[PDB]
Design an enzyme around this catalytic site. Structure first.
Site, PDB file in Angstrom:
ATOM      1  N   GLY A 183      34.931 112.927  25.269  1.00 42.56           N
ATOM      2  CA  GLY A 183      35.568 111.708  25.743  1.00 42.56           C
ATOM      3  C   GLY A 183      34.985 110.448  25.125  1.00 42.56           C
TER       4      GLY A 183
ATOM      5  N   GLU B 249      30.369 114.516  27.049  1.00 42.69           N
ATOM      6  CA  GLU B 249      31.151 115.692  26.666  1.00 42.69           C
ATOM      7  C   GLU B 249      31.840 116.297  27.883  1.00 42.69           C
ATOM      8  OE1 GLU B 249      28.109 117.947  24.613  1.00 42.69           O
ATOM      9  OE2 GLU B 249      29.389 118.015  22.817  1.00 42.69           O
TER      10      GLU B 249
ATOM     11  N   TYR C 236      41.218 119.711  36.387  1.00 39.40           N
ATOM     12  CA  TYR C 236      41.500 120.439  35.156  1.00 39.40           C
ATOM     13  C   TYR C 236      42.998 120.634  34.971  1.00 39.40           C
ATOM     14  CZ  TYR C 236      41.573 124.440  31.914  1.00 39.40           C
ATOM     15  OH  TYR C 236      41.810 125.287  30.862  1.00 39.40           O
TER      16      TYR C 236
ATOM     17  N   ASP D  41      43.724 103.003  26.269  1.00 39.30           N
ATOM     18  CA  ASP D  41      43.528 104.050  25.272  1.00 39.30           C
ATOM     19  C   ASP D  41      44.647 105.094  25.338  1.00 39.30           C
ATOM     20  OD1 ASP D  41      42.231 105.148  23.097  1.00 39.30           O
ATOM     21  OD2 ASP D  41      40.674 106.175  24.239  1.00 39.30           O
TER      22      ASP D  41
HETATM   23  N1  LIG Z   1      40.866 117.067  32.696  1.00 40.41           N
HETATM   24  C1  LIG Z   1      41.033 117.819  31.595  1.00 40.41           C
HETATM   25  N2  LIG Z   1      41.594 119.030  31.619  1.00 40.41           N
HETATM   26  C2  LIG Z   1      41.625 119.462  30.353  1.00 40.41           C
HETATM   27  N3  LIG Z   1      42.138 120.676  30.031  1.00 40.41           N
HETATM   28  C3  LIG Z   1      42.242 121.337  28.849  1.00 40.41           C
HETATM   29  C4  LIG Z   1      41.634 120.800  27.689  1.00 40.41           C
HETATM   30  C5  LIG Z   1      41.733 121.480  26.456  1.00 40.41           C
HETATM   31  C6  LIG Z   1      42.440 122.703  26.380  1.00 40.41           C
HETATM   32  S1  LIG Z   1      42.619 123.601  24.868  1.00 40.41           S
HETATM   33  N4  LIG Z   1      44.204 123.277  24.206  1.00 40.41           N
HETATM   34  O1  LIG Z   1      42.549 125.171  25.151  1.00 40.41           O
HETATM   35  O2  LIG Z   1      41.498 123.172  23.819  1.00 40.41           O
HETATM   36  C7  LIG Z   1      43.041 123.237  27.529  1.00 40.41           C
HETATM   37  C8  LIG Z   1      42.938 122.561  28.755  1.00 40.41           C
HETATM   38  N5  LIG Z   1      41.089 118.526  29.573  1.00 40.41           N
HETATM   39  N6  LIG Z   1      40.713 117.535  30.319  1.00 40.41           N
HETATM   40  C9  LIG Z   1      40.198 116.442  29.767  1.00 40.41           C
HETATM   41  S2  LIG Z   1      39.445 115.226  30.714  1.00 40.41           S
HETATM   42  N7  LIG Z   1      40.326 116.217  28.461  1.00 40.41           N
HETATM   43  C10 LIG Z   1      39.789 115.280  27.630  1.00 40.41           C
HETATM   44  C11 LIG Z   1      40.564 114.129  27.407  1.00 40.41           C
HETATM   45  F1  LIG Z   1      41.706 114.002  28.008  1.00 40.41           F
HETATM   46  C12 LIG Z   1      40.100 113.085  26.579  1.00 40.41           C
HETATM   47  C13 LIG Z   1      38.862 113.212  25.937  1.00 40.41           C
HETATM   48  C14 LIG Z   1      38.080 114.362  26.143  1.00 40.41           C
HETATM   49  C15 LIG Z   1      38.547 115.391  26.986  1.00 40.41           C
HETATM   50  F2  LIG Z   1      37.812 116.447  27.156  1.00 40.41           F
END
Ligand SMILES: Nc1nc(Nc2ccc(S(N)(=O)=O)cc2)nn1C(=S)Nc1c(F)cccc1F
EC number: 2.7.11.1
Length: 290
Positions: free
Chosen positions: A25, A29, A93, A136
Site C-alpha cells: 500500500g 505491506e 478482505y 488515489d
Molecule cells: N482488502 C484487500 N483485499 C484484497 N484482496 C486480494 C488482493 C490480491 C489478490 S490476487 N489477484 O490473488 O493477487 C486477491 C485478493 N486486497 N486488499 C487490499 S487492501 N489491497 C491492496 C490495495 F487495494 C492497495 C494497495 C495494496 C493492497 F494490498
C-alpha cells in the site's frame, strides 16, 4: 488517539493467522489473513513504526478516514493491534482482487467497464457526500469481492474537507492519475477524484493510463500543460464521452459523481454486479494455467 486501537495485551499473532503477501500500500505491506475466532479471511496491513518517520501521522489519518466510512463501497476497517514495534491494521478482505488484477487475462468489455465504473461512482458519491476525497483513485485501488461487489481501497492519502477548510492543496496521489490542479497544488476538492476516475476509465479500457511508458516526473509538466487525454481506439462514443467529461482541465466543468451515475455510458452498458463473477472466474482459470 487511534480509532479502532485494540487492547495492547491482545496479540494479533495469536488472533490472526498471517498468510501470503497480497500487496504493497501507500504505507506498509498487506497480507491475506485468517481471523482465528470467526475463521473469516481478512486483509492485514502491517507497518513497522520504528522504521517510520513523518509517516505515522499519515498512518493515523488513514485509519481515521477508514473508521469514519460506513458504506458497501468502501473496504471495512476492523481495528488495529500492536505487536512490539509493528502495527497490524485489520481490513475487510475482498476475494476477487483488484480491477487491475482482473485485467491480466485480457481486455474488459464495455459492460464490465460500465459496471465497475458505476460502482466506483457509488463509492465516490458516498465519500464526497461525507466531504472526503480519496485522492488515489486507480484500478489497483479498486477491489472486488468474489461475488463481484466493487469497493474502494487504500485511503492512505485520503483527505477531509471541513467548514474551516473547503479545499485542499497538498501534493498527493499517483502521478499518472493525478489531476492538473493537484499537481499544480491549486485549491482543489472532490473534482480531483473525478479527473482520476477518467484516467481510471482509460486504464479499464486500455489496461494502462495515459503516459504510462514515461518517467513519472515528466507528468509534472505534461499534465498541467497538455490538452487532457482522450480515449483512443475502437471504443463506443458514450465511453469516449464519459472519459472526456471526466478529463476536463477545468474542475468546475467536470460532473459530480452523482451526475455521472446517470451518464448514458453507464445507463446503457452497466449490468448487475453479480455478473462480474465471470471476470473473477476468468482470472482464476487464467492464473491456474499460469
Ligand atoms: N482488502 C484487500 N483485499 C484484497 N484482496 C486480494 C488482493 C490480491 C489478490 S490476487 N489477484 O490473488 O493477487 C486477491 C485478493 N486486497 N486488499 C487490499 S487492501 N489491497 C491492496 C490495495 F487495494 C492497495 C494497495 C495494496 C493492497 F494490498
Amino acid at each position: 488517539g487511534l480509532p479502532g486501537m485494540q487492547n495492547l495485551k491482545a496479540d494479533p499473532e495469536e488472533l490472526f493467522t498471517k498468510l501470503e503477501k497480497i500487496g504493497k500500500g501507500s504505507f506498509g505491506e498487506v497480507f491475506k489473513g485468517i481471523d482465528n475466532r470467526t475463521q473469516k479471511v481478512v486483509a492485514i496491513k502491517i507497518i513497522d513504526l520504528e522504521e517510520a518517520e513523518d509517516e505515522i501521522e499519515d498512518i493515523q489519518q488513514e485509519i481515521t478516514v477508514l473508521s469514519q466510512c460506513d458504506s458497501p463501497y468502501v473496504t471495512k476497517y476492523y481495528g488495529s493491534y500492536l505487536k512490539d514495534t509493528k502495527l497490524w491494521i485489520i481490513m475487510e478482505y475482498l476475494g476477487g482482487g483488484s480491477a487491475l488484477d482482473l485485467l491480466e487475462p485480457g481486455p474488459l468489455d464495455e459492460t464490465q467497464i460500465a459496471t465497475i465504473l458505476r460502482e466506483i461512482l457509488k463509492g465516490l458519491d458516498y465519500l464526497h457526500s461525507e466531504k472526503k476525497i480519496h485522492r488515489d483513485i486507480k484500478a489497483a485501488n479498486v477491489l472486488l469481492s468474489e461475488h463481484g461487489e466493487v469497493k474502494l481501497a487504500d485511503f492512505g492519502v485520503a483527505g477531509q474537507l471541513t467548514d474551516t477548510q473547503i479545499k485542499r492543496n497538498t501534493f498527493v496521489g499517483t502521478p499518472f492519475w493525478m489531476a492538473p490542479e493537484v499537481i499544480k497544488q491549486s485549491a482543489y476538492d472532490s473534482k480531483a477524484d473525478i479527473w482520476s476516475l477518467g484516467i481510471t476509465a482509460i486504464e479499464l479500457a486500455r489496461g494502462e493510463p495515459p503516459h504510462s511508458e514515461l518517467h513519472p516526473m515528466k507528468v509534472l509538466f505534461l499534465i498541467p500543460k497538455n490538452n487532457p487525454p482522450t480515449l483512443e481506439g475502437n471504443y463506443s462514443k458514450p465511453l469516449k464521452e464519459f472519459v472526456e467529461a471526466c478529463l476536463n482541465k477545468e474542475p468546475s466543468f467536470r460532473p459530480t459523481a452523482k451526475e455521472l451515475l446517470k451518464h448514458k455510458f453507464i445507463l446503457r452498458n452497466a449490468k448487475k454486479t453479480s455478473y462480474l463473477t465471470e471476470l473473477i472466474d476468468r482470472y482464476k482459470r487464467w492464473k491456474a494455467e499460469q
